[PDB]
Amino acid sequence: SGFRKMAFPSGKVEGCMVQVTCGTTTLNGLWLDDVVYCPRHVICTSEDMLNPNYEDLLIRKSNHNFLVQAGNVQLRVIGHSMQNCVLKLKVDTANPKTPKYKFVRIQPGQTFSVLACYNGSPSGVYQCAMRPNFTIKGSFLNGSCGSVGFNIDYDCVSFCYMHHMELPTGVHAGTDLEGNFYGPFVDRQTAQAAGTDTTITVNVLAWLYAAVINGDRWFLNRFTTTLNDFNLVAMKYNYEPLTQDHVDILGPLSAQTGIAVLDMCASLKELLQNGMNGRTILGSALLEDEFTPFDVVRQC
Amino acid sequence: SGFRKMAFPSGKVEGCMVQVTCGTTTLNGLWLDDVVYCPRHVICTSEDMLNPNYEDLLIRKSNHNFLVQAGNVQLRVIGHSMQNCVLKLKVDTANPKTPKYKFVRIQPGQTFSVLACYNGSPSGVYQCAMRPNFTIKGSFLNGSCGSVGFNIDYDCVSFCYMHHMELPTGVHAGTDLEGNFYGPFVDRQTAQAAGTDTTITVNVLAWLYAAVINGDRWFLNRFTTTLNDFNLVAMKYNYEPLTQDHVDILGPLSAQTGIAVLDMCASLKELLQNGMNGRTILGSALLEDEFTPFDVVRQCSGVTF
Numbered sequence: 001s002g003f004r005k006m007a008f009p010s011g012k013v014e015g016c017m018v019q020v021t022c023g024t025t026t027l028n029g030l031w032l033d034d035v036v037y038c039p040r041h042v043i044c045t046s047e048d049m050l051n052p053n054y055e056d057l058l059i060r061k062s063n064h065n066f067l068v069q070a071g072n073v074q075l076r077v078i079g080h081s082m083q084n085c086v087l088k089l090k091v092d093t094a095n096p097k098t099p100k101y102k103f104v105r106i107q108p109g110q111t112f113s114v115l116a117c118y119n120g121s122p123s124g125v126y127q128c129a130m131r132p133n134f135t136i137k138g139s140f141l142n143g144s145c146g147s148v149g150f151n152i153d154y155d156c157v158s159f160c161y162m163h164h165m166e167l168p169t170g171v172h173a174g175t176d177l178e179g180n181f182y183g184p185f186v187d188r189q190t191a192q193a194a195g196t197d198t199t200i201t202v203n204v205l206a207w208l209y210a211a212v213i214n215g216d217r218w219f220l221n222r223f224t225t226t227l228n229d230f231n232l233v234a235m236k237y238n239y240e241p242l243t244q245d246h247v248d249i250l251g252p253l254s255a256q257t258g259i260a261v262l263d264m265c266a267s268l269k270e271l272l273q274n275g276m277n278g279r280t281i282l283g284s285a286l287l288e289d290e291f292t293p294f295d296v297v298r299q300c
Numbered sequence: 301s302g303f304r305k306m307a308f309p310s311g312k313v314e315g316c317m318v319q320v321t322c323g324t325t326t327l328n329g330l331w332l333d334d335v336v337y338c339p340r341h342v343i344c345t346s347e348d349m350l351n352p353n354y355e356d357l358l359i360r361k362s363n364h365n366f367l368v369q370a371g372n373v374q375l376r377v378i379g380h381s382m383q384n385c386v387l388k389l390k391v392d393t394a395n396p397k398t399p400k401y402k403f404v405r406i407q408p409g410q411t412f413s414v415l416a417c418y419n420g421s422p423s424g425v426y427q428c429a430m431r432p433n434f435t436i437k438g439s440f441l442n443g444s445c446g447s448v449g450f451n452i453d454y455d456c457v458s459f460c461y462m463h464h465m466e467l468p469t470g471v472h473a474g475t476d477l478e479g480n481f482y483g484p485f486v487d488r489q490t491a492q493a494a495g496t497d498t499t500i501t502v503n504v505l506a507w508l509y510a511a512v513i514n515g516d517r518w519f520l521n522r523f524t525t526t527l528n529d530f531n532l533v534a535m536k537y538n539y540e541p542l543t544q545d546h547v548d549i550l551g552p553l554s555a556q557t558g559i560a561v562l563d564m565c566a567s568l569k570e571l572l573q574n575g576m577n578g579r580t581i582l583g584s585a586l587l588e589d590e591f592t593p594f595d596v597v598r599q600c601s602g603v604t605f
């Protein structure tokens with residue numbers, strides 16, 4: 001019993017964290033096999049940063065301009081290429097701690113663990129969701145660039161995020177491990193603003209099923225709703241629309257607890273209308289949206 | 301920017317997790333050097349738990365009754381001894397992944413990371429506080445017994461907790477790595493209840509400084525208070541008393557933000573008597589008490605491990 005925000009054990013990712021230095025910039029790299037992946041902005045001189053031509057800047061670099069450090073050992077860079085917004089530094093040593101891994105691009109609402117690093121050294125591990133506006137609400141200071149987001153597929157690490165930047169509101173933006181940004185963001189200092197964030201409705205419903213499994217039932221009601229009536233209400237509270245895919249995904253939790261999805265949907269409508277009235281759900285006074293249906297089933 | 305509940309990187313502890321099987325019970329063990337530590341209740345069946353004589357049960361066991369598995373390799377148990385509520389299985393092979401480590405007993409209010417395991421396999425890592433009532437509000441299913449709580453000090457893992465059981469309210473009880481329980485709990489299937497929990501006041505204050513560092517200032521007020529007046533108000537809302545040690549510990553955060561500890565206490569006093577008024581602090585509608593002052597400085601400064 002109990003319900004916690006839980007990250008994946010970070011050990012397999014720690015063995016991959018290295019420090020990447022290019023001129024005056026030092027950030028983190030992900031060393032997998034004989035390749036170190038890191039944000040391409042490591043080649044910028046904070047003058048290039050506003051409108052950088054990364055192809056032009058990388059063409060002027062040589063392998064000896066990149067200093068890669070894995071622990072107390074300097075790695076030798078023997079090649080450099082760019083895939084979208086990620087820099088790939090080919091090294092002359094394969095990482096012996098390379099786990100079984102895969103590069104996955106995730107969708108909004110999906111959760112993942114972040115291994116926050118500074119100077120190629122892991123300092124903390126936490127849990128995130130890809131916000132509907134494609135930002136992540138992380139905890140990152142200067143030097144965290146190159147920190148990665150991942151999930152563990154029972155032995156295999158699926159890398160889904162690399163941290164690139166912090167937006168003016170303190171939220172974070174980055175890319176998949178193929179360098180493609182999540183969201184309408186670019187790796188430039190140009191004026192960028194995240195869209196208005198919304199609540200991940202399917203995740204809130206998943207978390208309400210976690211509360212029911214844990215014995216919390218006070219928010220349950222005798223009502224059901226149509227999916228369209230629920231979406232009309234939920235959207236007025238800045239909640240994401242719930243699709244038929246989401247309803248289907250909540251099926252196993254619906255079967256486990258005996259509460260139909262549209263029945264739980266009516267509980268959610270009521271909570272949005274009334275608030276909590278001094279009560280908590282799973283020790284929280286707000287509706288939690290960073291637990292997916294897959295996370296709830298896994299944890300419970 | 302940002303503030304998250306953050307655990308220590310679990311890598312050094314993952315290399316120590318093994319599966320311990322004794323008869324029909326399977327749980328986790330912590331393999332450090334040539335010894336595997338695990339809850340002594342692994343030697344018990346459903347009948348023993350009602351009233352077990354652990355010395356009598358362990359005397360009837362032989363080294364071959366314990367099956368220790370580190371990954372896909374079976375370890376050979378060459379000795380067995382008991383230290384309080386922990387079982388120590390001496391093995392023929394020293395763990396090559398043994399990190400620099402130390403066994404430490406923590407105090408209520410202190411936080412630590414939990415590496416939740418099942419069948420000697422780590423499945424999740426979460427950060428939690430040792431509640432003032434000595435329970436932990438964990439997330440554990442059957443088979444999690446033997447999962448450990450730790451902190452990382454430079455490059456040294458300080459093991460502070462081993463999970464033993466779940467109380468009727470869903471909260472958890474366990475011991476330090478020397479087998480001594482945290483709290484008035486025993487390792488037996490008996491009617492046990494946790495005491496009434498209280499809020500870790502120093503941690504709430506530390507978390508209010510984290511909110512100020514992150515730009516959330518709405519709760520700040522012009523007022524200050526005496527430590528005695530604050531404690532009289534805090535005692536009334538089931539908050540732990542704040543000692544001069546706590547005030548001193550909050551000193552660096554007080555200096556960093558320009559808000560004196562008793563000045564922040566006056567904000568906390570108002571938050572207690574008046575509530576949040578529909579507002580949030582760090583995205584939370586409740587005052588968070590599972591971040592110590594050291595955790596806040598570490599997170600808002602980037603200390604690495």
Ligand SMILES: O=C(Nc1cncc2ccccc12)[C@@H]1CCN(Cc2nnc[nH]2)c2ccc(Cl)cc21
Nearest residue numbers: 041049140141142144145164165166187188189301
């Ligand atoms: O923002 C970044 N990384 C950081 C990551 N996480 C959390 C942070 C918290 C405080 C500071 C920096 C943080 C870096 C470096 C700084 N600046 C901003 C900038 N670029 N020139 C002028 N100012 C930019 C701008 C664009 C890009 Cl792609 C990357 C970056």
Ligand SMILES: O=C(Nc1cncc2ccccc12)[C@@H]1CCN(Cc2nnc[nH]2)c2ccc(Cl)cc21
Nearest residue numbers: 001341346349440441442444464465466487488489
């Ligand atoms: O409670 C325990 N451990 C668990 C840990 N974390 C979370 C759990 C969630 C669901 C179930 C079990 C959980 C075990 C096993 C169960 N039983 C009760 C018992 N009664 N007859 C024999 N065993 C007891 C009783 C006492 C002790 Cl010390 C330990 C234990």
Ligand SMILES: [Cl-]
Nearest residue numbers: 552593594597
């Ligand atoms: Cl401090």
